[PDB]
Design a binder for this molecule. Sequence first.
Ligand SMILES: [Mg+2]
Length: 679
Amino acid sequence: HLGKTEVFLNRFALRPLNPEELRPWRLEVVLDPPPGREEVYPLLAQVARRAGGVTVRMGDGLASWSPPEVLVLEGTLARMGQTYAYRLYPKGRRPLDPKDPGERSVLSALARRLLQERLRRLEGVWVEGLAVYRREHARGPGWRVLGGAVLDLWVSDSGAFLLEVDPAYRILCEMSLEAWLAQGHPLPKRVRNAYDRRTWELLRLGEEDPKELPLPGGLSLLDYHASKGRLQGREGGRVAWVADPKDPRKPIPHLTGLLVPVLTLEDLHEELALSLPWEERRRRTREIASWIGRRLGLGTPEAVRAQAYRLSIPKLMGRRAVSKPADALRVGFYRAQETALALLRLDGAQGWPEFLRRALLRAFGASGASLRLHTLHAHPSQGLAFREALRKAKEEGVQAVLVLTPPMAWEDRNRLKALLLREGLPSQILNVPLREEERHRWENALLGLLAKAGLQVVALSGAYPAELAVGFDAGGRESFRFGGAACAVGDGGHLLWTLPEAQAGERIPQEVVWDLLEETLWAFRRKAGRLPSRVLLLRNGRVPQDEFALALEALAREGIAYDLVSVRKSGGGRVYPVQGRLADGLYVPLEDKTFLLLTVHRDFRGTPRPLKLVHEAGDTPLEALAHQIFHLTRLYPASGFAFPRLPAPLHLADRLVKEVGRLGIRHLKEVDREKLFFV
DNA sequence: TGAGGTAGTAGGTTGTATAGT
RNA sequence: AUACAACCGUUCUACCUC
Ligand SMILES: [Mg+2]
């Protein structure tokens, strides 16, 4: 069950490395005072930057593509307050073999630096690292938007340059605060220094004179900024009151002549289309690749191809087959039970709208389960009595409450949610200027409601390598030492979530991961009276792989087969068809155990971002894994009309982590973990 | 709070380090 | 909190989609 086709990656093959590049100059470093021994590594890279060439770190020394005589071989550094004196010593050259991953790594660091350094020298071109911006996409009243691309340059195993390209844009507010003010434009959100990158939350304009404000040092504002050479060639203008990097109420003094506004997208909207149709993006990518090759003498670009296989579209089962979850409202649910729902009105109206009661009764008739609708005659304004009302509805079997309400402020939303959650009542909010013809909104609402209640509504009828697929999210951190969360989808049925639930400090990451996993295991055991034969482990690849060692070990001790797979929402590059149209379910195998996956592609103008996956453990054939993950993409019961770009367990753990973020909510004790309260 | 995506940007986190010796 | 380094980037705004 597949297909076959060919695609271009947004990578390009360029010229072979010439003999000199294959034989970099080697340099021995001498510092004073030496020190470090274990800290003698960031220092090495820093020296490699101070030298001022195409030079990188290589072993205990330096590799360079720049002749040592055009380097700053002797100079000084200031690292964390300490001042070092360095001298570089040319020690001849040493050949590097691309076939050695270490040496090729060095070669690629050199290639990257080559790209950046050579791009800096181009006239009529703006460069901010691995980003180059040529043309001018749009300009108006003091600000312009430049169009270019983000790049990378590394070295193949066959010893040739490889150039990744992807068009981006840049919003430059090429002016000054003072002026910007004049144009009559409104004071922006945050403001930025004109002499560095530190940015302060713009609080208010001042009322006093810069030559008066006494600073902690004896200096005034104006001559403080004058002393450090900043008023040299510019008019300081009026005084401003910026707010600190983090957050505070204690403001700081600044100058509208040393401040530059920073425009977000919305600021431009108050005057866009920075998305590109995939055809246009491919074109511009090619153009910029040939342009770079031309200007840098790297030859004419050969776009790299790759075989791609069109995966089979999954079989979504409600009562019968469905194209999308929303249809199950007409057709019926996969596994319905005796369910009790509750209404909570905050618009001071009475009961269920008729079309909602109808839609629900219909959907449940088509499922033969018997539905029971309650109404909460209670309000949060009551105090404890409200909590009591909630408790009563719970004991009467209510599983979830729909909340008809005008647009709630963030804080009130979270407070209300958390409130119902204390009494074990998941809730779906429906904003109440509500017409019946708004089918999408209230049907999605209804789906969320039912999901929260514990219904299944849809399933994948297929057969898959692992009957348990659990996804791991680590919040916004690079480890589970500070907690994270898991969501489990059982082949394509049953849904569970788990929190770290064991403090957030002196926690061993491996043990956290194993705890999440073990709890999902035990949930599965409770629902099935057995342990699963194989589990699919999905992580977001932002935490070290070592953090799953204990979980894998434990899965083995228990005779449970596994497959560890890493999923990265960003970095997969772009993917274009050679001929024809680009479609869903694209599987694009790549290097050692890694592949691309173009899961989603609907009526959006912009180019799709393929997923990048790495089979890090287990002996399941890649195509099989890609199959299962792609199908897991279609098992999100809350979206109803559109599929998420990520597999259900990861998408779920994302919404979960974000919701715990929004609410409390350490011990969500009364909430059943079969109930997806966070969608 | 209806939800899916591509767009930039702020915005954020985590790691090492400061001095001491 | 300072510096440096690495990575991610929901909110928001917009366009749209069903
Ligand atoms: Mg929801």
